[PDB]
């Protein structure tokens, strides 16, 4: 299912298949079903060449066409037009053209997808966003790498290598920094690394565990978990002052904070009721409220950017899977069907979830659309990959 749409190979071998990136982006969203390339009624290279009737016969009311041309200096011009084949046939609904160097060709495709997506759904596109994650390689000296790639797995680069375990990266809302857990000192420490220059700020290294960071959306605070007291509890740092307040205090374990849009409330995982469940608490007036009542276990949540839902790892009768819970109804929908589903993270427009599974025996991340309609494996890495974290809008 999803809205059928025509995505035509772009007019030029071409250095990159821009039309294919657009189709893959739109499909990944769940919201679209780009027509199989072998079943296209034609391959128009321009808006004028589009025959609306041949696309409307197939249930298609919009068509993406475009052009890639070489510039004498070795750069490329990428243009797309979105042509109506429904109520205003032959009309151009959106279009753009821009000049890119060869290494920004995928990015040129993701721009087109973002604009076509927003035009047709009214939802901001997330195809130019990034993911962070940790890979344990088979290298001896620095087996752990914190890496970043495009959301779809291409254009990977290394942010930090370590001889010791890394965990749980988290993006600043401006997209310029990653917080994370490192065991490089011989025990856990929480640090924030600035991506542009690699500078590292030391945030915390209290006795026992320092973990599971999250930046508030307004950019002012970092939430995280400490076990110095005897069990894991939540704390928040005012990033300007460096000051730390305690948020949960109790004998139970409380970890994996995620922010609500207001930058004042956290959801988090607690074992207070026995098996893990998700709770909500104010970082000021402290008294946690249980919010997950389906299944027998729920954990590791990520609240959407509009505050309307969250994703999490939910267990009902033996099966642990990525699930989505409406925060104003308690209604739960199971999204993933893979094995050992863990650590979900939502795209900034709430339309896709990245998470880890048994696919590739640990070496693959997976995408699932939050409507449940589309599922895929990302390109395999050269190691075990864990703790994905989907960037803000960039």
């Amino acid at each position: 299912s999803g809205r059928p749409i025509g995505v035509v190979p772009f007019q030029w071998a071409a250095p990159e298949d821009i039309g294919g990136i657009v189709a893959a982006d739109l499909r990944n969203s769940g919201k679209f079903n780009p027509l199989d390339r072998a079943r296209l009624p034609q391959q128009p290279g321009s808006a004028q060449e589009v025959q609306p009737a041949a696309w409307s016969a197939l249930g298609i009311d919009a068509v993406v066409v475009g052009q890639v041309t070489p510039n004498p200096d070795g750069s490329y011009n990428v243009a797309y037009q979105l042509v109506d084949t429904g109520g205003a046939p032959g009309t151009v609904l959106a279009q753009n053209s821009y000049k890119v160097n060869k290494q920004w060709l995928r990015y040129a495709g993701h721009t087109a997808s973002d604009e076509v997506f927003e035009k047709l759904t009214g939802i901001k596109g997330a195809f130019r966003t990034r993911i962070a994650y940790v890979v344990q390689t088979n290298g001896g000296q620095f087996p752990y790498e914190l890496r970043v790639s495009d959301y779809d797995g291409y254009n990977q680069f290394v942010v930090h290598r370590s001889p010791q375990c890394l965990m749980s990266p988290a993006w600043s809302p401006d997209g310029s920094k990653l917080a994370y857990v490192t065991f490089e000192s011989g025990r856990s420490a929480l640090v924030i690394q600035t991506l542009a220059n690699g500078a590292v700020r030391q945030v915390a290294s209290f006795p026992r565990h320092n973990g599971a960071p999250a930046f508030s959306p307004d950019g002012s605070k970092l939430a995280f978990a400490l076990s110095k007291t005897g069990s894991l509890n939540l704390y928040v740092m005012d990033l300007a002052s460096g000051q730390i307040r305690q948020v949960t205090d109790g004998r139970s374990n409380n970890t994996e904070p995620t922010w609500f849009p207001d930058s004042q409330n956290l959801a988090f995982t607690s074992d207070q009721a026995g098996r893990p469940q998700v709770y909500k608490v104010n970082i000021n007036g402290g008294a946690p409220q249980r919010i997950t009542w389906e299944g027998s276990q729920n954990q590791d949540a990520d609240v959407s950017s509009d505050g309307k839902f969250m994703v999490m790892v939910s267990s009902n009768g033996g099966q642990q899977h990525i699930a989505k819970q409406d925060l104003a109804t308690g209604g739960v929908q199971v999204l993933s069907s893979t094995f050992l589903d863990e650590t979900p993270s939502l795209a900034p427009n709430g339309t896709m979830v990245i998470y880890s599974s048994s696919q590739g025996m640990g070496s693959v991340l997976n995408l699932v659309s939050t409507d449940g309609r589309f599922k895929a494996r990302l390109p395999a890495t050269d190691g075990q990959v864990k703790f994905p974290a989907w960037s803000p809008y960039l």
């Binding site: 965990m167 749980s168 599971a212 994996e256």
Partner: peptide, 16 residues
């Protein structure tokens, strides 16, 4: 192994 001691979270012995 690096672990939060929780017995259950994502930072509980994630790397075996």
């Amino acid at each position: 192994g690096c672990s939060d001691g929780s017995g259950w979270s994502s930072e509980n012995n994630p790397w075996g």
